[PDB]
Amino acid sequence: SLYNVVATL
Amino acid sequence: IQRTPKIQVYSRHPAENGKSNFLNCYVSGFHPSDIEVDLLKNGERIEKVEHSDLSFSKDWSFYLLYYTEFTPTEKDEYACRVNHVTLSQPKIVKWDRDM
Amino acid sequence: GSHSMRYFFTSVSRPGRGEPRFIAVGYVDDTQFVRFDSDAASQRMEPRAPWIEQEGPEYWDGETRKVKAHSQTHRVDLGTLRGYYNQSEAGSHTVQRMYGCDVGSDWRFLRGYHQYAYDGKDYIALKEDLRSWTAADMAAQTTKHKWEAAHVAEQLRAYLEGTCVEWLRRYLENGKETLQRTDAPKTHMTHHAVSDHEATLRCWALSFYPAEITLTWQRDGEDQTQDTELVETRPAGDGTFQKWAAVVVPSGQEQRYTCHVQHEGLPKPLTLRWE
């Protein structure tokens, strides 16, 4: 299962 | 950065004339991911070729497996043709039953 | 008996027209189980292993939603990095991301990972303590400062030590018939005369799983690397792997050479010698 939140660089 | 592809051409199972098998072309260690890979039968490109989903190794270089169903003979010749930004011209690797 | 779950993401910008090509794949140890390809017709996360097909609709809808949010983050990233590196808008560039967790032999969390690359080189990575970041250059340093202020590490740590491990264990159970089975390499040796006085012995290891393996040649009981050649481990295409190592020897002296095979699937390493 994939992570829920993705922060931008 | 750019990295040139390593290439291996081989069959999934021990080669034996007349018996159905799978011809593989494994390309790895390259970057960027765009690459052109063709499996050849007596100099001509084979149409029913598939490939694995793009993945990469610890050092970020890419790898892909191209493959097709085939039945080897004593005459027919097989090879893998690869072209990449790092190559001046397409690279041809002939299939060797013993490798 | 350790295991891992890993997700790999690749986004390539296409300046001539449209959005980046995005490809995501998920793996449990050396087994791919899901994928997403922005060029595919489904526009959904798709199964690549029988045992994941057990998951219901809510699973697939959720993974699809999340993987699409991942692709948009990468799309934005490609733009951000282009600026940081002050690069032209006409060239194609690549962002890669990989993350996941490992469980030890005790089946408990062992370690987590979360790293990023731009044009095939390390950009920023979460350190093993899962609290600090390794930034490779000054572009990555700005990202690092932003992630520290937003406390991104804390968020990832929670996932890697919890959710990640919980699902890895769930998958390991659901696909235990294959995922918890080791396939010992099937081995044999071939002989090829290269001249009137020399021959090549090739030691084969076929159909094994997992991929990790070691093939070594010894001559009269001692390791030999000269006159040898070992190919990189390669996928057979049916989920297993192959590898071979060869040595050139004086014809008639084949008996002095032995091939040694170490693999998780072998209670004791195997030793092969020419007939």
Tab-separated table of N, CA, C and O in Angstrom, chain C residues 109-153:
chain	number	residue	atom	x	y	z
C	109	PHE	N	9.693	-4.518	12.080
C	109	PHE	CA	10.297	-3.434	11.310
C	109	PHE	C	11.813	-3.504	11.465
C	109	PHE	O	12.317	-3.645	12.578
C	110	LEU	N	12.528	-3.405	10.351
C	110	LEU	CA	13.983	-3.435	10.359
C	110	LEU	C	14.503	-2.061	9.905
C	110	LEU	O	15.373	-1.461	10.551
C	111	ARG	N	13.975	-1.559	8.791
C	111	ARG	CA	14.381	-0.241	8.316
C	111	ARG	C	13.445	0.315	7.256
C	111	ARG	O	12.676	-0.425	6.633
C	112	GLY	N	13.505	1.632	7.087
C	112	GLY	CA	12.671	2.307	6.110
C	112	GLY	C	13.542	3.108	5.170
C	112	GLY	O	14.689	3.456	5.501
C	113	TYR	N	13.001	3.400	3.993
C	113	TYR	CA	13.731	4.165	2.992
C	113	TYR	C	12.800	5.135	2.283
C	113	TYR	O	11.606	4.875	2.119
C	114	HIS	N	13.380	6.238	1.829
C	114	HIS	CA	12.666	7.249	1.064
C	114	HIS	C	13.724	8.130	0.398
C	114	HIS	O	14.265	9.033	1.043
C	115	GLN	N	14.030	7.848	-0.870
C	115	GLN	CA	15.034	8.610	-1.614
C	115	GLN	C	14.581	9.075	-2.993
C	115	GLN	O	13.682	8.483	-3.618
C	116	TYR	N	15.271	10.105	-3.472
C	116	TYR	CA	14.942	10.790	-4.719
C	116	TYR	C	16.160	11.079	-5.590
C	116	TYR	O	17.254	11.364	-5.079
C	117	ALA	N	15.958	11.040	-6.902
C	117	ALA	CA	17.030	11.334	-7.848
C	117	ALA	C	16.540	12.241	-8.965
C	117	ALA	O	15.378	12.188	-9.351
C	118	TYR	N	17.447	13.053	-9.499
C	118	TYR	CA	17.128	13.932	-10.618
C	118	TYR	C	18.209	13.632	-11.650
C	118	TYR	O	19.408	13.629	-11.337
C	119	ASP	N	17.767	13.380	-12.876
C	119	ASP	CA	18.630	12.983	-13.988
C	119	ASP	C	19.663	11.890	-13.666
C	119	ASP	O	20.825	11.963	-14.071
C	120	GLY	N	19.206	10.880	-12.926
C	120	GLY	CA	20.031	9.732	-12.605
C	120	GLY	C	21.057	9.855	-11.500
C	120	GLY	O	21.909	8.969	-11.348
C	121	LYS	N	20.974	10.937	-10.736
C	121	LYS	CA	21.890	11.153	-9.624
C	121	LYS	C	21.139	11.443	-8.325
C	121	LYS	O	20.079	12.078	-8.340
C	122	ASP	N	21.704	10.986	-7.204
C	122	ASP	CA	21.114	11.235	-5.895
C	122	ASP	C	20.742	12.700	-5.790
C	122	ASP	O	21.513	13.587	-6.210
C	123	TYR	N	19.565	12.954	-5.226
C	123	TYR	CA	19.090	14.306	-5.014
C	123	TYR	C	18.922	14.456	-3.499
C	123	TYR	O	19.713	15.141	-2.858
C	124	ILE	N	17.934	13.790	-2.905
C	124	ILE	CA	17.768	13.884	-1.456
C	124	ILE	C	17.292	12.512	-0.937
C	124	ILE	O	16.530	11.806	-1.606
C	125	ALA	N	17.762	12.118	0.240
C	125	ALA	CA	17.362	10.826	0.789
C	125	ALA	C	17.163	10.905	2.290
C	125	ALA	O	17.856	11.664	2.979
C	126	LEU	N	16.187	10.141	2.780
C	126	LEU	CA	15.900	10.069	4.201
C	126	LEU	C	16.969	9.152	4.786
C	126	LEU	O	17.212	8.056	4.255
C	127	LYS	N	17.639	9.600	5.850
C	127	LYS	CA	18.665	8.775	6.499
C	127	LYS	C	18.016	7.617	7.244
C	127	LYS	O	16.808	7.635	7.513
C	128	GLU	N	18.837	6.633	7.618
C	128	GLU	CA	18.362	5.437	8.309
C	128	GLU	C	17.630	5.690	9.627
C	128	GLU	O	16.751	4.909	10.006
C	129	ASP	N	17.979	6.772	10.324
C	129	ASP	CA	17.297	7.100	11.580
C	129	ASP	C	15.894	7.642	11.293
C	129	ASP	O	15.105	7.867	12.213
C	130	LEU	N	15.595	7.843	10.011
C	130	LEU	CA	14.304	8.362	9.589
C	130	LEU	C	13.975	9.702	10.235
C	130	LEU	O	12.807	10.015	10.467
C	131	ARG	N	14.987	10.495	10.551
C	131	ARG	CA	14.699	11.793	11.152
C	131	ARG	C	15.429	12.938	10.462
C	131	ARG	O	15.007	14.083	10.559
C	132	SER	N	16.515	12.617	9.766
C	132	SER	CA	17.314	13.621	9.072
C	132	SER	C	17.441	13.272	7.599
C	132	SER	O	17.221	12.125	7.211
C	133	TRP	N	17.828	14.268	6.801
C	133	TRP	CA	17.986	14.128	5.362
C	133	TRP	C	19.402	14.302	4.830
C	133	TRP	O	20.217	15.089	5.358
C	134	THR	N	19.698	13.571	3.762
C	134	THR	CA	20.998	13.677	3.092
C	134	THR	C	20.711	14.412	1.765
C	134	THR	O	20.058	13.869	0.889
C	135	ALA	N	21.198	15.647	1.632
C	135	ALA	CA	21.005	16.452	0.429
C	135	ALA	C	22.325	16.466	-0.340
C	135	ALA	O	23.355	16.864	0.209
C	136	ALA	N	22.311	16.053	-1.606
C	136	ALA	CA	23.552	15.979	-2.384
C	136	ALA	C	24.176	17.282	-2.884
C	136	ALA	O	25.383	17.326	-3.093
C	137	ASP	N	23.367	18.321	-3.082
C	137	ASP	CA	23.865	19.610	-3.563
C	137	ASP	C	22.977	20.729	-3.025
C	137	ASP	O	22.064	20.483	-2.226
C	138	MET	N	23.202	21.948	-3.496
C	138	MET	CA	22.457	23.084	-2.972
C	138	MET	C	20.995	23.169	-3.404
C	138	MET	O	20.198	23.812	-2.727
C	139	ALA	N	20.638	22.519	-4.514
C	139	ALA	CA	19.227	22.497	-4.916
C	139	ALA	C	18.533	21.624	-3.861
C	139	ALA	O	17.505	22.009	-3.267
C	140	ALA	N	19.110	20.449	-3.620
C	140	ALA	CA	18.581	19.509	-2.631
C	140	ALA	C	18.562	20.118	-1.222
C	140	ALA	O	17.688	19.786	-0.418
C	141	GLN	N	19.519	21.002	-0.924
C	141	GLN	CA	19.567	21.675	0.380
C	141	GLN	C	18.317	22.527	0.607
C	141	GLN	O	17.814	22.606	1.725
C	142	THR	N	17.837	23.189	-0.444
C	142	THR	CA	16.641	24.020	-0.294
C	142	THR	C	15.438	23.116	-0.015
C	142	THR	O	14.550	23.462	0.783
C	143	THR	N	15.397	21.964	-0.684
C	143	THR	CA	14.312	20.997	-0.474
C	143	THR	C	14.395	20.530	0.979
C	143	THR	O	13.382	20.444	1.689
C	144	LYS	N	15.612	20.220	1.420
C	144	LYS	CA	15.818	19.761	2.788
C	144	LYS	C	15.274	20.782	3.798
C	144	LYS	O	14.540	20.412	4.716
C	145	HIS	N	15.616	22.060	3.629
C	145	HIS	CA	15.128	23.083	4.561
C	145	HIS	C	13.598	23.133	4.609
C	145	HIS	O	13.002	23.276	5.681
C	146	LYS	N	12.974	22.999	3.444
C	146	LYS	CA	11.523	23.028	3.348
C	146	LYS	C	10.884	21.823	4.040
C	146	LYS	O	9.871	21.956	4.736
C	147	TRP	N	11.489	20.654	3.866
C	147	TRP	CA	10.951	19.431	4.458
C	147	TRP	C	11.153	19.363	5.962
C	147	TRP	O	10.357	18.739	6.663
C	148	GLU	N	12.196	20.017	6.466
C	148	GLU	CA	12.426	20.036	7.908
C	148	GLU	C	11.350	20.897	8.573
C	148	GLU	O	10.782	20.513	9.591
C	149	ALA	N	11.068	22.055	7.978
C	149	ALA	CA	10.058	22.977	8.497
C	149	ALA	C	8.664	22.356	8.435
C	149	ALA	O	7.840	22.574	9.316
C	150	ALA	N	8.400	21.579	7.393
C	150	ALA	CA	7.098	20.956	7.264
C	150	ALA	C	7.048	19.622	8.025
C	150	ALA	O	6.001	18.987	8.088
C	151	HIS	N	8.176	19.211	8.598
C	151	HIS	CA	8.268	17.962	9.360
C	151	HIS	C	7.898	16.728	8.550
C	151	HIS	O	7.218	15.827	9.049
C	152	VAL	N	8.349	16.688	7.305
C	152	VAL	CA	8.061	15.570	6.408
C	152	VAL	C	8.601	14.225	6.920
C	152	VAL	O	7.971	13.184	6.744
C	153	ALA	N	9.764	14.258	7.559
C	153	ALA	CA	10.372	13.045	8.086
C	153	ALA	C	9.440	12.339	9.079
C	153	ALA	O	9.268	11.107	9.034
